[PDB]
Amino acid sequence: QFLRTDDEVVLQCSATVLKEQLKLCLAAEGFGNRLCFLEPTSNAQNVPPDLAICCFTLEQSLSVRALQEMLANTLLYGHAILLRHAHSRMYLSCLTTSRSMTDKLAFDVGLQEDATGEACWWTMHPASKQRSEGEKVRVGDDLILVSVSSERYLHLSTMQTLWNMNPICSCCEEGYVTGGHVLGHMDECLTISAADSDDQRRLVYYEGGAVCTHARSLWRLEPLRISWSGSHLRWGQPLRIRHVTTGRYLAQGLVVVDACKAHTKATSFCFRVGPPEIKYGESLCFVQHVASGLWLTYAILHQEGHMDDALFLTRCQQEESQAARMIHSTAGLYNQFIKGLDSFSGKPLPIEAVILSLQDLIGYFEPPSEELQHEEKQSKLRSLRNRQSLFQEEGMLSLVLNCIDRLNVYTTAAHFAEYAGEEA
Amino acid sequence: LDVAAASVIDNNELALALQEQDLEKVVSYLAGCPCGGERYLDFLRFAVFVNGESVEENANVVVRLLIRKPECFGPGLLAAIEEAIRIFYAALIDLLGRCAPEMHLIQAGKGEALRIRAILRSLVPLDDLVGIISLPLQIVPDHKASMVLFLDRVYFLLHVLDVGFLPDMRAAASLDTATFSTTEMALALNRYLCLAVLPLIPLFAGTEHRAIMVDSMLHTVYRLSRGRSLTKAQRDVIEDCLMARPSMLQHLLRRLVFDVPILNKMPLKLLTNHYERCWKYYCLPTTSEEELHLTRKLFWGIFDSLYDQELYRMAMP
Amino acid sequence: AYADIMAKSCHSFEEKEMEKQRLLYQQSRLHTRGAAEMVLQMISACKGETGAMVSSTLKLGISILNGGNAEVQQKMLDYLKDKKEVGFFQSIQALMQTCSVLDLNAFERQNKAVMADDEFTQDLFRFLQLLCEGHNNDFQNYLRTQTGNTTTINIIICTVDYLLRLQESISDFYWYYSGKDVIEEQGKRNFSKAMSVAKQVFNSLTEYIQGPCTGNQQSLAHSRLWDAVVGFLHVFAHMMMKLAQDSSQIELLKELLDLQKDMVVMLLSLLEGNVVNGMIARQMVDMLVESSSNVEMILKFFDMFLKLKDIVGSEAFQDYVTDPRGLISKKDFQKAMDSQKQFTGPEIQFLLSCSEADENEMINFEEFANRFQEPARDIGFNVAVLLTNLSEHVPHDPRLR
């Protein structure tokens, strides 16, 4: 159809892969690198596609002249288009730095921390034979996206390559429980393993306490549809659920193996009590999962359990969510680094990426400072203290110099110059 | 028919005036293009500009169309050199580079459209330097003149300067005497003229660089092409001297003293006198024995002689 | 040459009635002769060809009509029907196509230095408009696309498509002006020429849909063009702020104002009445809803012009800043306005800016009320009328309320 803008838009590219047509949605980690790598989404039953790595956000469009004027200071083909990755929060624009593989034209695509200037605007020639300038370039037909402060072109690797735009969220509605925020029950709202999935299969254990909120007590997912997974949730719509943190998927019976294998094994779960009727903090019925009459609460089965099944609905304030995603990426990297150190015995880029991630983390956890008025300071401190509190629970940062020790040991330094990979 | 293409060269209004559709058609023909195609492209570039400088609107359109269709010999310079060794096509590539250079923006930012300027810059590689290296390897000769021009248009200089100087000093040896009679150098001489303008623009390297200046003076005198161009090269040398440096002043000074003695042709003497005046200007505050000997030559020079005489007299003063 | 000669030849209540009779007489003589058939044939031959000769023929055709005259209209319709065509509409279409629109690159080249042609496009659109009028449900219906010809054409649809492009160019030009002090000049003249051509086209479009013919109106409405006028309406507002904002001054302002009035008239004309709640009405309401900010700005501007005038008229205001020979002094006018205590502060500063200083914060002012009150009075009325009618027809929806 036609998009006014101000609504997140997700783009998937395209053609066929390995003699098979395939669609990959562009996405980037952001922290630990702004480079975005397309992720294949071929089978839902086999695996659950991840919407976290592909964002959007449409805010500025007008026409080239307007853009120039602004720089000096319904989407229209063209006009000016701005994309926001919330996820990664920072905007994505063509990056001057040259690509590692090949040489001549193009550059790695990343979103600058600051959206200001010519570097980040792309640049849509809503071009199709049917399409013409001065059009309602609505959903469904590319069109060329060369920048802007370019140069060309995106990309295409893994000529002009056309990407087809998927409307991730049609519109925003309020309560409106929502497709994926994602947020009576004795406070003890449902919980996953506290600390780290020691069970590793996601054990309900159940919960109440600081643990709780508190940490690792959130879920989002839950697409049983590749696109337009927005508009609230229809009762018993049927969606998958992923526990936040190293949650993967949870639906050995109950509890979840890693999301791909785990998803196939427990291919999908639904809840039984576009227009939105679900109410946040309101309903929500009982669960369970379908594919077996089995009903959650207690816990698994019978299906049959005393009355209480009703699940109480959260809320999320987004900063916490961003923090969780960050903890997961940087944390994974730390784990990888530790593994690398272990691999190194040591018998007679990545680092690097870790260093960039570390710098970003330091920047985040940066102190509010005294510059703020008896106001900026008050606001920031509660927030910083809160972020610190949220992290303390996972505490890899802690895993931190724990590794630090491994590094000191290779010390002296590098015993001396490097167990392996010198420059390293 | 181009020729008919030429119909438009000197005029500025006509150039500003030409419609973009025609340019697009020409671009398309070029894209379809192939030595003939290269020639067509060169004609197109001349048409696109003409100087002084280049039309902003025309330049912009041309650059955009070119960026849009790539033609474009696959990609490099080394490959072209290899092809030259095997043997033209290299000439055509050079012409394209020259056209891009002529297309370069000026005088300076800002702004803007230096984007644009940046797209063009990315377009060059490593770059003007690679071109200089290619020129050194070549040291056809007329070819790559644009590359030299492009670097200036395109844009530590001494290090770059060192590579260029080696290629130069040579021409001078080959040029004088029989070689001077030989005309391959004359083609080379024209390039030399272009280089000097570029010339117009650690310490030990500079001093070695100082040797190159002496070599240049030797080329200037002489043998034997005009002349007016020679004068320009000479002014440049004079300008270089003004910019300059005691050691350089020195050995060059002795060679100059010998030249002065020989003089005591006429134009060379005038140039030497100008150089002496420059040295004097540089000498309020300012080997010494050598200078004294040179001066005695002047007293002697006055003696040797005994309007044009008046200018000679001013030089003597 | 002969065609031109013929056109030249064609060239107080009692006088008005007469003059009309005389014109009817010459045109009548030409009509009796079959000239209309000739014009149609010539137009058909062009076969989409673009040439002055085509232009000369168009001029001759405009000359033949002008002020209508039924024998001619009837004859033309009859001839077209008899010929069953032909692809005359095809040629007309090709021409509705290829009309020059203001282009920024061309303008820039001219500035660096004809171009931005041509007036003739205006003349062709004018002929198309002269065709409307009189009012032919049958004629309007044929204009829709006819029945006998194998093709048909969306004619009015085509004109609508063309208007959209013209608005885009005007918008681009305004964006380019940006507001770099102005008025630059030379260009202002080129712009005025462009504005004038567009006005004629707009009027013709209105006349075409002007007849209360259910089919033509319904068709245009479903079509696509809006939109279009929505965007034009938005640009118009910014241009309006700019003039007035400096002493460009009056001529440009007047030209800008006239075009807006014509647009308003066309909009009023489109509804042509309806159900208390009607699809057309809903669509109009929707467009208005879509644009709250632009409309709001225009309304605010009008109120400011009227409000200011009222204030000026007031005795208390005259009293606050006594002067030997006029002016409220910069301070001085600001303070009095503050005193009546009814204005946007940014708005107040803007008003001060609109006022023209004369070597020391001295303003004649009465002149200020007069200009721009006369032009406002002329346009403002049309706007109010449309708004009122719309409000009367569909309450609710409230947003409109």
Dihedral angle sign, alpha carbons of residues C189, C195, C200, C203? negative
SS (H, E, C) chain A: CCCCCCCCCEEEECCEECCEECCEECCEEECCEEEECCEECCCCCCCCCCCCCCCECCCCCCCHHHHHHHHHCCCCCCCCECCECCCCCCECEECCCCCCCCCCCCCCEECCCCCCCCCCCECCCCCCCCCCCCCCCCCCCCCCCCCCCCCCCCCCCCCCCCCEEECCCCCCCCCCCCCCCECCCCCCCCCCCCCCCCCCCCCCCCCCCHHHHHCCCCEEECCCCCCCCCCCCCCCCCECEEECCCCCCCCCCCCCCCHHHHHHHCCCECCECCCCCCECCECCCCECCCCCCCCCCCCCCCCCCCCCCCCCCCCCCHHHHHHHHHHHHHHHHHHHHHHHHHHCCCCCCHHHHHHHHHHHHHHHCCCCCCCCCCCHHHHHHHHHHHHHHHHHHHCHHHHHHHHHHHHHHHCCCHHHHCCCCCCC
Chain A partners of C178 at a C-beta cutoff of 8 Å? 69, 72
| CA nearest neighbour of C57 among C42, C44, C70 | C42
Checking phi first, is residue A301 left (phi over 0); if not, alpha (psi -120 to 50) or beta? left
**What single-letter DSSP state applies at residue C228?**
S
Residues near C305 by Cβ (< 8 Å), separated by ≥ 6?
A: C372, C373, C376
Judged by CB atoms closer than 8 Å, whether chains meet at A69 and C168 is answered as no
Both tokens of A340, joined, read 């690398």
Q: Chains A, C: CB contacts under 8 A, how many?
A: 16
Residues near A361 by Cβ (< 8 Å), separated by ≥ 6?
A: A31, A326, A330, A397
Judged by CB atoms closer than 8 Å, whether chains meet at B122 and A151 is answered as yes
Instruction: Establish how many alpha carbons lie within 13 A of residue B73's alpha carbon, considering only the half-sphere containing its beta carbon.
Output: 17
Q: Centre a 10 Å sphere on the Cβ of residue C14 and count the other Cβ atoms it contains.
A: 7
Rounded Cα gap, residues C41 and C86, in angstroms: 10
Place of tokens 């042609």: C117
Helices (H), C276-344: 279-290, 293-313, 315-320, 329-340
**What single-letter DSSP state applies at residue C356?**
P
Both tokens of B19, joined, read 């419609």
**CA-to-CA separations, C113 to C62, C178, C186, in angstroms, rounded:** 36, 21, 12
CB B102 within 8 A of CB B45: yes
For chain B, give the number of residues. Answer: 317
Whether C207 has a binding-site annotation, put simply, is yes
Tell me phi and psi for residue A224, to 5 degrees.
Answer: -105, 15
Shortest Cα–Cα distance, A88 to chain B (Å): 27
Judged by CB atoms closer than 8 Å, whether chains meet at A118 and B115 is answered as yes
Chain A partners of C170 at a C-beta cutoff of 8 Å? none
Judged by CB atoms closer than 8 Å, whether chains meet at B16 and C108 is answered as no
**What single-letter DSSP state applies at residue C93?**
H
Both tokens of A384, joined, read 């910083």
Chain B partners of A150 at a C-beta cutoff of 8 Å? 119
Q: What is the CA radius of gyration of chain B?
A: 24
Cα dihedral B41→B44→B46→B47 (10° resolution): 180
Chain A residues 119-148 with a CB less than 8 Å from chain C: 134
Place of tokens 């168009």: C58
Rounded Cα gap, residues B192 and B173, in angstroms: 13
Mutate which of A5, A61, A65 to disrupt the C interface (most C C-beta within 10 Å)?
A65
Residues near A313 by Cβ (< 8 Å), separated by ≥ 6?
A: A177, A183, A279, A280, A281, A282, A283, A284
What does the buried/exposed string (b/e) look like for A261-288 if buried means 16 or more CB atoms within 10 Å of the residue's CB?
ebbbebbbbbbeeeebebebeebbebbb
Shortest Cα–Cα distance, A71 to chain C (Å): 12
Chain C partners of B16 at a C-beta cutoff of 8 Å? 109, 112-113
For chain A, give the number of residues. Answer: 424
Rounded Cα gap, residues C329 and C321, in angstroms: 8
Both tokens of A409, joined, read 């040991």
Both tokens of A401, joined, read 């110099």
- Spacing of C-alpha A118 from chain mean position: 26
Rounded Cα gap, residues C201 and C207, in angstroms: 10
What does the buried/exposed string (b/e) look like for C162-199 if buried means 16 or more CB atoms within 10 Å of the residue's CB?
bbbebbbbbbbbbbbbeeeebbeeebbebbebbbebbb
SS3 category, B122 = helix
Cα dihedral B236→B237→B239→B241 (10° resolution): 170
In single-letter form, the type of residue at position C330 comes to K
Rounded Cα gap, residues B114 and B120, in angstroms: 9
Residues near B132 by Cβ (< 8 Å), separated by ≥ 6?
A: B147, B148, B151, B160, B163, B164
Q: Considering only alpha carbons, which residue of chain B is nearest residue A151?
A: B119
| Cα-Cα end-to-end distance for chain A | 52
- Spacing of C-alpha C222 from chain mean position: 22
CB B191 within 8 A of CB B175: no
Judged by CB atoms closer than 8 Å, whether chains meet at C175 and A72 is answered as no
Q: Considering only alpha carbons, which residue of chain C is nearest residue A133?
A: C165
SS (H, E, C) C37-51: HHHHHHHHHHCCCCC
Q: Centre a 10 Å sphere on the Cβ of residue B107 and count the other Cβ atoms it contains.
A: 5
CB A165 within 8 A of CB A139: yes
Exp. method: cryo-EM
SS3 category, C143 = helix
Place of tokens 């510059």: A371
**Touching partners of B (3+ C-beta pairs < 8 Å):** A, C
Is A72 within 8 Å of chain C by CB? yes
- Spacing of C-alpha A377 from chain mean position: 30
Both tokens of B256, joined, read 């100059």
Q: In what order do the strands lie in the sheet with A10-13?
A: A39-40, A24-25, A10-13, A164-166
Rounded Cα gap, residues C186 and C192, in angstroms: 10
| Cα-Cα end-to-end distance for chain B | 61
Whether C133 has a binding-site annotation, put simply, is yes
Tell me phi and psi for residue A30, to 5 degrees.
Answer: 90, -95
Chain B partners of A159 at a C-beta cutoff of 8 Å? none
Chain B partners of C109 at a C-beta cutoff of 8 Å? 16-17, 57
CB A268 within 8 A of CB A275: no
Bridge partner residues of A220 (DSSP): A242
Place of tokens 């295409």: A156
Rounded Cα gap, residues A248 and A399, in angstroms: 21
Rounded Cα gap, residues B313 and B24, in angstroms: 63
Judged by CB atoms closer than 8 Å, whether chains meet at A72 and C178 is answered as yes
Q: Considering only alpha carbons, which residue of chain C is nearest residue B16?
A: C109
Checking phi first, is residue A162 left (phi over 0); if not, alpha (psi -120 to 50) or beta? beta
| CA nearest neighbour of C187 among C119, C108, C257 | C108
**Touching partners of C (3+ C-beta pairs < 8 Å):** A, B
Both tokens of C308, joined, read 């200011």
Chain B partners of A105 at a C-beta cutoff of 8 Å? 122
In single-letter form, the type of residue at position B39 comes to R
Interrupted after residues, chain B (C–N over 2.5 Å) = 33, 75, 87, 139, 155, 201, 244, 264, 286, 306
Interrupted after residues, chain A (C–N over 2.5 Å) = 73, 158, 183, 251, 273, 298, 348
In single-letter form, the type of residue at position B41 comes to L
**Chain C interface with A: residues with Cβ < 8 Å:** 104, 164-165, 168, 171-172, 175-176, 178
SS3 category, B93 = helix
CB A182 within 8 A of CB A221: yes
Both tokens of C378, joined, read 């002329």
Residues near C386 by Cβ (< 8 Å), separated by ≥ 6?
A: C264, C267, C268
Rounded Cα gap, residues A287 and A298, in angstroms: 12
CB A216 within 8 A of CB A194: yes
Tell me phi and psi for residue A29, to 5 degrees.
Answer: -65, -40
Q: Centre a 10 Å sphere on the Cβ of residue C289 and count the other Cβ atoms it contains.
A: 12
| CA nearest neighbour of A267 among A249, A246, A285, A252 | A249
Tell me phi and psi for residue B11, to 5 degrees.
Answer: -60, 135
In single-letter form, the type of residue at position B225 comes to S
**CA-to-CA separations, A148 to A11, A119, B105, in angstroms, rounded:** 18, 7, 19
In single-letter form, the type of residue at position C74 comes to Q
Is B53 within 8 Å of chain C by CB? no
- Spacing of C-alpha C346 from chain mean position: 31
Checking phi first, is residue C131 left (phi over 0); if not, alpha (psi -120 to 50) or beta? alpha
Judged by CB atoms closer than 8 Å, whether chains meet at C109 and B16 is answered as yes
| Cα-Cα end-to-end distance for chain C | 60
Shortest Cα–Cα distance, A151 to chain B (Å): 7
Chain C partners of A69 at a C-beta cutoff of 8 Å? 175-176, 178
Chain C partners of A134 at a C-beta cutoff of 8 Å? 164-165, 168
Q: What is the DSSP string of C185-209?
A: SSHHHHHHHHHHHHHHHHHHHHHHH
Q: Chains A, B: CB contacts under 8 A, how many?
A: 10
What does the buried/exposed string (b/e) look like for C105-142 if buried means 16 or more CB atoms within 10 Å of the residue's CB?
ebbebbeeeeebeeebbbbbbbbbbbbbbbebeebbeb
